[PDB]
């Protein structure tokens, strides 16, 4: 079966990002909506839009029968989730192949398989991935973890089986590990646990793949997204810089091993961490297109989109191998957050939205001038990509493009982004930079005034 | 001597351009307006902005006096004349000389040799440039150059500029498509031979006619920045006004080898005339300016919602620059790019780049030339 019609079950920047591929291809596209998303620039940019109804994900996006139900009314006959809501969801991936419809993703099976940390791990054994010591199955109990600490050694992580706290000593152990299991259950409903060596200070640097469903895979590049905040990123970058050429070669011949094993297909990402000495290990498989996957996108000279399109066909790769980077690219989230009030977010109106442009900008964008920020969905504005011939030229056009970018009406991490880039600890040298993980809350000088 | 503040003698999308870039570059930029202008987006844009006063281009942008006055009180030590106005006067290159200012443009010399056809005949043909010894159907083909002070030469790439009307350039697209690696080395090597024969130096471009036959002749240079520089850098991955900087600040060129392109680009000029009534310029408010944005994108303008094209600068709002992975992907991009640029108020030539990006003889190699859109399009267009 050939896409011929696309609903784009998701809103704001991906949205638009999804329409616009659509578009290039020569295919109609169908948007949808929730009732405050109503004015929405996807909305307005898609070929038709079916109101969902409801105020909140839950009563309208993460709704199984509402989506399907647009599909079947506006006669799609093929579904990209975007990322978040539902294109992790495995139950409705087959829901949607079950009604006839092509889901543009991987099968509902490695959704599952790669979703789950124990049957990642053990595809990721099989794939000869490199793996910090850890148990190859969840722990039984806390002395197990003590067991695993005193014959590998501390400090390390105990972390959901099905969904994280770090021990330093042997005293401490057992009360995180109940903690471990109690955060666990609270939150995912299942209280197994793993152990692994925990790694201080690492980098996150991953592997965007590109995988038809033939076993031809291909790494488009790495980008590192340490510039993080409790897990959740807000700078990303392509390449992934002051790698040695065998450090990327570890990563890209193991992401292409991983996915095979895993019989995986569609173009997510298989994230690493880097740590302090420069050891490279495996993280997760994000079965998804990532946020991100812009500054691959500029720097690789591939439509991602379009690749998950050609992928859910059933055509061959039409790349033969991994590009080399052409020039650097980096990714500013414009999220609705207050920096000055640890990133808590703010409703409010857009009363001016001004992005910049010229040379080196791309910007994806969810919002224009007028649009209505609400609670009810994630901060995200828009991206603000930029790219220029090296990193040097892209730090130096990035400052000039967050010069420009003008959002009024309601706080943004902007002043955060204007900050880093000129921050000596993320323009590093020529032998690194000293950012990681836990960089921005933990070492980064805070100085952004509150909105 | 280094420059350490630009004065940018210009208005429009070129002053906002050289802005951006000085910006990049770390550099303090000083805008100029005529009372028109006063308003414009590059004059809020810049660090600095200095009034010409003045309602005609006589009065303001091209007053020498005027010019080397807002320079000596804003304090500037250097001036980008951008192109138009004064990027092609010698006499004006000698006056910002004379008055101890960087002119970031090429020797005065150069400019009077290489804009004058019979001794730019000459400079051509000691340097063994092809020559016109008819030109069937020709395309437009051009070497952009970069130069140093030191004699070294690079070819950043090629483009071609055949959708023209009556010499008038609308789209350009790089790399210059459907050549053979012999004819990209004839092209290259002789604009190379052409700039060191006339002791250039600068960002400027060395035209060609590309016959049906192959046959390729020598056509003009182009001593300034020109204005579809975007699709250059775009696959060639070099920012050219940071070149031009480099340059005039006496600098070797860091860049060693003509570099590889990657994708293609095509630009389209987002003039106020209109296409539906012979290409006749169509002054008038830009009620709403909606740009389009996303993957492939880039938007050099100058003008915004509020902005007003009168009769007496040129007809040009912005240029839209769409790069793919390659020729077809630039297309389909172009295509969907022009289809979300909004533009009210006036009439613009969006309606002719929308048709012409699907029309068989650009899509083809192709069938277009120098004289196709005024002799072979199958102009449609309704007026608006």
Request: glycine share 8%.
């Amino acid at each position: 079966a050939r896409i011929s019609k696309v609903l784009v079950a998701n809103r704001g920047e991906i949205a638009v990002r999804v329409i616009r591929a659509a578009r290039d291809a020569g295919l109609p596209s169908v948007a949808v909506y929730a009732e405050p998303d109503a004015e929405s620039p996807h909305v307005r940019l898609a070929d038709e839009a079916f109101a969902l109804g409801g105020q909140t994900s839950a009563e309208s996006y993460l709704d199984f029968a509402k989506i399907l139900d647009a599909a079947a009314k506006s006669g799609a006959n093929a579904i990209h989730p975007g990322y978040g809501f539902l294109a992790e969801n495995a139950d409705f991936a087959q829901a949607v192949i079950d009604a006839g419809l092509i889901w543009i993703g991987p099968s509902p099976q490695s959704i599952r398989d790669l979703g789950d940390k124990v049957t990642a791990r053990h595809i990721a054994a099989r794939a000869q991935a490199p793996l910090v010591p850890g148990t190859p199955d969840p722990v039984k109990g806390a002395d197990e973890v003590v067991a695993f600490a005193e014959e590998y050694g501390l400090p390390i992580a105990i972390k959901a089986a099905h969904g994280m706290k770090v021990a330093r000593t042997i005293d401490e152990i057992p009360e995180l590990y109940e903690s471990a299991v109690r955060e666990a259950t609270a939150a995912f409903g299942r209280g197994e646990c793993y152990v692994e060596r925990y790694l201080d200070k690492p980098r996150h640097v991953e592997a965007q793949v590109i995988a038809d469903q033939h076993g031809n895979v291909v790494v488009a590049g790495t980008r590192d997204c340490s510039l993080q905040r409790r897990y959740q990123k807000l700078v990303e970058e392509a390449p992934a810089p002051f790698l040695t050429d065998f450090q990327r070669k570890e990563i890209h011949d193991s992401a292409k091993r991983i996915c095979k094993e895993a019989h995986y297909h569609g173009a997510g990402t298989v994230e690493y961490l880097v740590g302090q000495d420069g050891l490279i290990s495996f993280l997760e498989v994000n079965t998804r297109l990532q946020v991100e996957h812009p500054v691959t996108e500029e720097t690789a000279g591939i439509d991602l989109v379009l690749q998950q399109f050609r992928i859910a066909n059933g055509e061959k790769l039409d790349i033969t191998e991994d590009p080399t980077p052409r020039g650097h690219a980096i990714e500013f989230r414009i999220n609705g957050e207050d920096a000055g009030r640890n990133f808590l977010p703010a409703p409010g109106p857009v009363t001016k939205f001004h992005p910049p442009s010229g040379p080196g900008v791309r910007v994806d964008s969810g919002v224009e001038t007028g649009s209505v920020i609400g609670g009810q969905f994630d901060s995200m504005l828009a991206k603000l990509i930029v790219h220029g011939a090296d990193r040097a030229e892209a730090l130096a056009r990035a400052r000039r493009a967050l010069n420009e970018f003008g959002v009024e009406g309601l706080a943004t991490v902007i002043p955060f982004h204007r900050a880093v880039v000129s921050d000596p600890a993320f323009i590093g040298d020529a032998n690194g930079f000293s950012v990681h993980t836990r960089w921005i809350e933990t070492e980064w000088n805070n100085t952004i005034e509150p909105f």
